[PDB]
Design a protein around this ligand. Structure first.
Ligand SMILES: COc1ccc(S(=O)(=O)n2cc(CCC(=O)O)c3cc(OC)ccc32)cc1
Length: 266
């Protein structure tokens, strides 16, 4: 009940090793001061083009179709790369790696979007979000100005993120919060459910211990985080549904196969 402090540190380390962008770095950039190099602000067609024209960034994107789809492709490509980082993060958790590969896939399948939305909060403020490794900032107004359905995808995530960031979690908190999301014993079709539940429980106890040390004055922070985890599950449900509509009504839009596997039988 004290080596929990070690468990946490192993998880913070797996986090620091596998994620391209920490919240700490993200916030130093969004707050402007500390990095002395402002991100390129993308807020219309003209600046988006300036940004593709080298100021910030193709990138193995599917064939061009139109502005709203191009932005979709940028987000989709980032999503896939974050799935890849989350996969490595989870694998750097010894307990996770002991599970059979089919249980690993089940947990990633059902957890990555929840985790992704939680980490989006790190690179977001009420006005927009960091793209291209911190070197760009895409405004929330611009994303809202895109053709429906694409202008509806990210909005609920901003709404989640602004409330989420109010809790002032740091990376060490987030490492445990993402672990708890991946290591969930409720995911449909798990094989060794007792094993995963067991690992989940350790992580949650580690998280509460961690939060006491790290946020001594914060009242009810653990329960609030358990609620947020439930909010995320609702978020992913809606995302999958929107993505179902884009697949049905937006046929010129190329959907990445990995993400198609995730939504399949969700
Ligand atoms: C750029 O960094 C990111 C990372 C993730 C997210 S996301 O909200 O999860 N999100 C995911 C997809 C498509 C891929 C999938 O099916 O998940 C997507 C498409 C959009 O079109 C404008 C907007 C947000 C999107 C947004 C920005």
């Amino acid at each position: 009940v004290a080596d929990l402090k070690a468990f946490s540190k192993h998880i913070y380390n797996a986090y620091l090793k596998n994620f391209n962008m920490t919240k700490k770095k993200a916030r130093s950039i969004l707050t402007g001061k500390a990095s002395h190099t402002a991100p390129f602000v993308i807020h219309d067609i003209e600046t988006l083009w300036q940004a593709e024209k080298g100021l910030v960034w193709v990138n193995g994107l599917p064939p061009y179709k139109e502005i709203s789809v191009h932005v979709f492709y940028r987000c989709q490509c980032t999503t896939v790369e974050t799935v890849r980082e989350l996969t490595e993060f989870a694998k750097s958790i010894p307990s996770f790696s002991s599970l059979f590969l089919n249980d690993q896939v089940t947990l990633l399948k059902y957890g990555v979007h929840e985790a992704i939305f939680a980490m989006l909060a790190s690179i977001v403020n009420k006005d927009g979000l960091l793209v291209a490794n911190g070197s760009g900032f895409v405004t929330r107004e611009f994303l809202r100005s895109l053709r429906k359905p694409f202008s509806d995808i990210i909005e609920p995530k901003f709404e989640f993120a602004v409330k989420f960031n109010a809790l002032e979690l740091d990376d060490s908190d987030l490492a445990l919060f993402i672990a708890a999301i991946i290591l969930c014993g409720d995911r449909p079709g798990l094989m060794n459910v007792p094993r995963v539940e067991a690992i989940q429980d350790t992580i949650l106890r580690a998280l509460e211990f961690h939060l006491q040390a790290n946020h001594p004055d914060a009242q009810y922070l653990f329960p609030k985080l358990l609620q947020k985890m439930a909010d995320l599950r609702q978020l992913v449900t809606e995302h999958a549904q929107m993505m179902q509509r884009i697949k049905k009504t937006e046929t010129e839009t190329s959907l990445h196969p990995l993400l198609q596997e995730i939504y399949k039988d969700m």
